[PDB]
């Protein structure tokens, strides 16, 4: 499933609803610790519509429990992520992913 | 594909290579003129590495044709951008994108 561990608390009142645009900064790491991606490195937040954007299950469930301003670590089992195939050229088969996510704003 | 039209020239000899980080300022518009994003509004340059599979095809092939210091208009057909899916709620399905880009430096 996904495990959420808070690094910094958010406001505790404003949680993402379906149809809202979540603006996040994330760093993705494999369970071993190799960073494979980061929006923070591109200097550009990832914006997606919760419910409309096709994302791995762990991300959808994990961000849904975060309130605005929270920074959390989501550890996602491969069945909640890219499973058995992985994502060619970026995620290996059967990988557990660790995401450091900050929910910056809901539009 | 990507059409690159010069607004102001670069040095004419330092072109991005695979494995280098392009640092750019840009504004992105849908072809009807609607602005959907800009690094200037975040006041941080956008950075991405060539070959790292982290930007749409139109960025990699467009910037590969620019020299440092160049400012250019890039027109990107949907098949070199978000295609038939778009980026729900930001980029519509089958959108041609127009970017005003300045390649500031390579690192
Ligand atoms: C640098 O790009 C990142 C993603 C966005 C920040 C950028 C973006 C909008 C990319 C589009 C592709 C833009 O490219 C185009 O639209 N190209 C258009 C085109 C294609 C072909 C022909 C013509 C035109 C995309 O893939 C959207 C997708 O929703 C992302 C956010 C999502 C993924 C990869 C979901 C997959 C989707 C497929 C499912 O099967 C799978 O199930 C396991 C889940 O990604 C995710 O679900 C998770 C959670 C959010 C962050 C992204 N993410 C990651 O796992 C990553 O960290 C990752 O590294 O993030 C990049 C992804 O690149 C595809 C790959 C992916 C491993």
8-state DSSP, B33: S
The C-alpha atoms of residue B8 and residue A101 are separated, in whole angstroms, by 38
The two tokens of residue A44 are 């550009």
User: Resolution for this model in angstroms, one decimal place?
Assistant: 2.0
The answer for A 48-87 residues in CB contact with B (under 8 A) is 48-49, 52-53
Closest CA to B6 of B100, B89, B82: B100
Question: Do residues A86 and A92 lie in contact, with contact meaning Cβ atoms separated by under 8 Å?
Answer: yes
Which residues in A lie closer than 8 A to residue B46 (C-beta atoms)? 42-44
The C-alpha atoms of residue A106 and residue A40 are separated, in whole angstroms, by 18
Give nearest CA residue, ligand 1 atom 2. B54
Query: For chain B, how are helix, strand and coil distributed in percent, rounded to 5?
Result: 10, 40, 50
Closest CA to B70 of B35, B3, B36, B25: B25
B20 CA from centroid of ligand 1 (Å): 22
Please judge whether B88 and A53 are an interchain contact, meaning their C-beta atoms are less than 8 angstroms apart. yes
Q: Is A85 in the pocket of ligand 1 (CB under 6 A)?
A: no
The two tokens of residue B89 are 């709620």
* All structural domains of chain B: 1-107 (3.10.50.40)
Question: Do residues B104 and B11 lie in contact, with contact meaning Cβ atoms separated by under 8 Å?
Answer: no
**Length in residues, chain A:** 107
């Amino acid at each position: 499933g996904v495990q959420v561990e808070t690094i910094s608390p958010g406001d505790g009142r404003t949680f993402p609803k379906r149809g809202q645009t979540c603006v996040v900064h994330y760093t993705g790491m494999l369970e071993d610790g190799k960073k494979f991606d980061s929006s923070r490195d591109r200097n550009k937040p990832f914006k997606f519509m919760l419910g409309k954007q096709e994302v791995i299950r762990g991300w959808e469930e994990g961000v849904a429990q975060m309130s605005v301003g929270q920074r959390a670590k989501l550890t996602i089992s491969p069945d909640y992520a890219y499973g058995a195939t992985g994502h060619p050229g970026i995620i290996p088969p059967h990988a557990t992913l660790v995401f450091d996510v900050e929910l910056l704003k809901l539009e």
